[PDB]
Amino acid sequence: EIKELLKLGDLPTSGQIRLYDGRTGEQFERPVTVGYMYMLKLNHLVDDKM
Amino acid sequence: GSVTEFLKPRLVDIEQVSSTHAKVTLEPLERGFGHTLGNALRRILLSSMPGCAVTEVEIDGVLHEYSTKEGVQEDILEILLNLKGLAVRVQGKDEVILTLNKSGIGPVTAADITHDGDVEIVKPQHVICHLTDENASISMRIKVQRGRGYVPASTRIHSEEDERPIGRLLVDACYSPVERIAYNVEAARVEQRTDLDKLVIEMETNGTIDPEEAIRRAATILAEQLEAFVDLR
Amino acid sequence: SVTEFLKPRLVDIEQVSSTHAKVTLEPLERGFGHTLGNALRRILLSSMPGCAVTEVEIDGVLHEYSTKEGVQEDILEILLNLKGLAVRVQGKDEVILTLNKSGIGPVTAADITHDGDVEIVKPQHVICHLTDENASISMRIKVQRGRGYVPASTRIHSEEDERPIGRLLVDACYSPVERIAYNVEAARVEQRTDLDKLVIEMETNGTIDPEEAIRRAATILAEQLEAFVDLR
Amino acid sequence: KPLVGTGMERAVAVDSGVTAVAKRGGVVQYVDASRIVIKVNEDEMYPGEAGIDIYNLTKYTRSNQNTCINQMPCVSLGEPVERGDVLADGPSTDLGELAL
Amino acid sequence: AVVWDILDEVIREHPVLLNRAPTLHRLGIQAFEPVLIEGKAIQLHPLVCA
Amino acid sequence: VLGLYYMTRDCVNAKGEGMVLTGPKEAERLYRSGLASLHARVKVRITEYE
C-alpha cells in the first residue's frame, strides 16, 4: 500500500532519490532516503544547564 | 585550435511564468564551466541578495506581543508572524514607515495598507487579521528597512537602541527574497560547435526582486571577491 | 551599505618549495570560502591550458606490452615516465621530438633532441635504464597544447583507428597542477565569530610557480564572468 | 498536525482538559481572540433558558513546568457547530488533533 | 571587547580538565587545550569521545 | 570506519578500470575530476619506505 501511494504521488517507488551536495555541487553516487518525519523538542534546553 | 581562448556566456533568454517563478538561460558555456558557474550562482543567490523586510511594529493600545486586542480574531503574536511573511519593494529610501487603518467586520489584507508611490506591495492578497465586530478597529505603524541575510531580534536589540520605547515591538527580519534555486545543464547547439553547453536556472522568490538584476548582482559580487585573488603577490 | 563585503587580505603565502606552496585568506563571509575554493579547484583541474606529451613511437614496438630486451624497465614504466615529463612549449602547439641513445645506465631527458621553442624543465628525470652496451633505444615522442585532462579511452576513436604498428598513446595531463586541496576554518574579527578563513595547498610540476597558476585561474574565471557584471 | 498519525489523537485531544469542547450544539454567533459566543439551536435549548452559551479561553498562564498555556479559537462567524465539536485549540492541538 | 581580547590572550596555553560522571576508569578525566566558540555546548573530538 | 571501508572496497567493473597512474596525486585528480570511481582497480606506481 505504501508503494501504491507513492506511485500515485509520482515519487520514486523505492523511496530513495538522487541528491546533490550543496557545498561542492557534485552528486552523491548512492541514492538516499529522503522523506518527512515528525520531530519533538525535549525540554532540556542548553541554556537551562550551562 | 584556439585552446587558450574561450567563448563567453550571455543571458540568451529569460522567461517569467509568475511574479514568483522565473527561468533564465546562459549560453554558450565550455565543458565543466557549466557546473562551477551554476554552483557559484546558486550559492551567491541564496546567501547574498539584498532584501526589504519588516522590522518594527507599533500598535496603539498594545504593550507587548503576548497581549490580546478586543476585536482581533488572532493573538498579537499571530499577526506579528503574519507581518513577518509580508513582502514589499521600496525604491527611494533605505527605510520607510507604513501605515494601516481599518474598521468594520472582515479580513484585513495588504490592499488596505496605505502606501506611498515609491512602495509596492507585491501580493495584496496576503491577509493579516480578521475584525469580528463593527466597532472593532485596528491602527498600526510598520517600519521597513533593507539588509542582507537574516538577523535575529536578539542581536537587533543588542544593537542597543538608546531609550527603547514601551509600545514598539521587534521581529526577526528574513530579508532574503530568494526562496529556491535550481540549475540544469544540457548540450548546446550553437553553430553546430561541439563541446558547448547551455545552462538554465529556475528560481522561486518573493515577487520583489528582479531576476535579471539578481543574477547580475550575484555575478558582480563573485567577480569582486575574485579580484582580491587577482591582486595576490 | 548592503553591497558591503569583507574583502580578504592576502594574509600569507608559505612556499615549502618551488612546486609546493600554501596560500591563506582571512577573513571571508560565511559560505564564501567554500564556493571560492570549489570553483578554483574545478578550474585548475579541468580547464587550465597546458602542454603535454601524447604519443610515442618506437620501431620495435607494436603494443604497450611489446617485449624489449636491453632496457631495464618495461614499456609501461617508460610510458609513465613520459607522462611525468615536465615540458613547456612557447612556439607551435604541436611538436615532435626524438631520442636515441646507446649507454649503460639512466636515459635522462637531457638526451632529447633540443629545440628553441621547447623547454624541458626537469632534464634530470629518468625515462628508463639501459642495461647493456651494444643495446640501443630509439623513440619519437609528440607534444601538444591542450586544456584540461584526457585519458586513453577518451582519445581513442574508430575515427582514428587507422594507426600504424609504431604508435602508442599517452594521457595528456595538460593542466600543470599536480594536486589542489582547500580547507575552510573559523576566524574572528570585530567580536564576530561567524566567518570563513580559507587555506589552499598546492603542488604543480616545475612549469610555473603555484602563485602564477592561481592568478591565471582567477583571471580565467573573471573573464568568464565579465559579460554579466554591469558594475564598474 | 502530524502527517503519519494513529487516529488516537482525536480522542486524546478531546478527552484532555485543555481543549474547549462544544457542550451544546448550535451556531457560533461571535468570536474574538478570547471569547466565544454560540447561539443554541431552538430544539436543543431548555425552556426558560437564554439559548446562548459563552466560553472564555485561558489566554496566557504559567504552566506547571513553566511552559505556555494558550487557547486559540479555530472557528469563524456563522459556522455551524455540533455537540462534542472542538471550538478552541489548546497547546499542541490543531483542529482537535494532538500536535506535539 | 578589550576584555574579550584579554580573555583570548590568557587561555592560549592553559589546559583544562574534562570529566564525565561516572569516572569508571582513569580515562574518564582528561586534559585539553581550549578553543573559544560562541554558543553553549562543549565540543569534543569524537575519537576521545569513544 | 564506514567511510574507510567504502573507500577501500573494490568492484569488478567501474569507471576507468585498468588504467595506470604515475602517482597517487594523479589518482586523486582522476577521482576528483570524475573520470574514475573510487572502486576501480588500477595499477599505480607507489613509493614506500622501511
Three-state helix/strand/coil letters over D48-72? CCCCEEEEECCCCEECCCCCEECCE
How far apart CA F34 and CA C225 sit, in angstroms, is 24
Task: Report the distance separating Cα C98 and Cα B120, nearest Å.
Answer: 74
Enter the CATH code of domain D18-92: 2.40.50.100
What does the alpha-carbon distance between residue B177 and residue B123 come to, in Å, rounded to a whole number? 14
Q: Name the residue in chain E with its Cα closest to that of A49.
A: E40
B102 in contact with D at a CB cutoff of 8 Å?
no
Number of H helices, E strands in chain E: 2, 2
Element (H, E) at B11: strand B10-16
Q: Which of D2, D65, D67 sits opposite A38 (nearest CB)?
A: D2
Closest by CA position to B28, among listed B221, B146, B198: B198
Alpha-carbon Rg for chain B, nearest whole angstrom, is 23
Contact F29, C87 (CB under 8 A): no
Phi-psi region of B216 (alpha: psi -120 to 50; beta: other; left: phi over 0): alpha
> How many angstroms separate the CA atoms of C196 and C202, rounded?
19
Report the candidate in C184, C155, C159 with the shortest Cα–Cα distance to residue C171: C155
Q: Which CATH number is B3-50+176-233's, of 3.30.1360.10, 3.90.226.10, 3.30.379.10, 3.30.1600.10?
A: 3.30.1360.10
In angstroms, rounded to a whole number, what is the distance separating the alpha carbons of residues A6 and A13? 6
- For residue D74, what is its C-alpha cell? 479555530
* Cβ(B136)–Cβ(D77) below 8 Å: no
DSSP class of residue C81 equals H
Which candidate, C1, C2, C3, C9, places its Cα nearest to that of C195? C9
Q: Which residues of C140-167 are buried (b: 16+ CB within 10 A; e: fewer)?
A: bbbbbbbbbbbbbeeeeeeeeeeeeebb
Q: Helix axis angle, C32-47 relative to C210-225, nearest 10°? A: 100
- Write out the E strands in D7-48: 20-21, 26-31, 35-40
β-sheet bridge partners, residue D70? none
Q: Does D3 touch chain A (CB under 8 A)?
A: yes
* Cβ atoms < 10 Å from Cβ of B118: 11
Q: Provide, as residue numbers in chain A, all residues whose Cβ is less than 8 Å from the Cβ of D97.
A: none
Q: The C-alpha cell of C133 is what?
A: 652496451
Residue C50 burial (C-beta neighbours within 10 Å; 0-12, 13-18, 19+): buried
Q: Which residue of C has its CA nearest to F20?
A: C80
Contact with chain B for residue A25, Cβ under 8 A = yes
Residues paired with D53 in a beta bridge: D38
Going from the C-alpha of A40 to that of each of A43, A46, B226, D92, E3, the distances in angstroms are 9, 15, 43, 11, 39
Find the length of chain D: 100
Task: Say which CATH class C2-49+175-232 falls into.
Answer: alpha beta
**Is the dihedral angle over the CA atoms D59, D62, D64, D66 positive or is it negative?**
positive
Check whether domain C50-174 has CATH 3.30.70.360, yes or no: no
The CA distances from residue B126 to B20, B54, B98, in Å, are: 14, 14, 16
Residue B213 near residue B31 (C-beta atoms within 8 A): no
Which DSSP letter does residue D84 get? T
Superfamily for domain range B51-175? DNA-directed RNA polymerase, insert domain (2.170.120.12)
**Residues on chain C touching B47 (C-beta within 8 angstroms):** 29-32
- CATH 3.30.1360.10 domain range(s) in chain B: 3-50+176-233
Shortest distance, CA E18 to any CA of chain C (angstroms): 23
Residue B212: left (phi > 0), alpha (psi -120 to 50), or beta? alpha
Delimit the CATH 2.170.120.12 region(s) of chain C: 50-174
Q: Is A24 on the interface with D (CB under 8 A)?
A: no
A21 in C contact zone (CB under 8 Å): no
B28: nearest Cα among B8, B42, B13 = B8
* Lookup result for grid cell 451556531: D27
Q: Which residues of C7-17 are buried (b: 16+ CB within 10 A; e: fewer)?
A: ebeeeeeeeee
Which residue has cell 602547439? C93
Chain E neighbours (≥3 Cβ pairs under 8 A) are: A, C
Rg (CA), chain E: 13
Q: How far is CA B227 from CA A36, B45, B211, C7, C223, in A?
A: 43, 19, 24, 9, 11
Chain C positions in Cβ-Cβ contact with residue E36 (cut-off 8 Å): 193
Helix axes C32-47, B211-230, angle to 10 degrees: 70
Residue type, C34: H
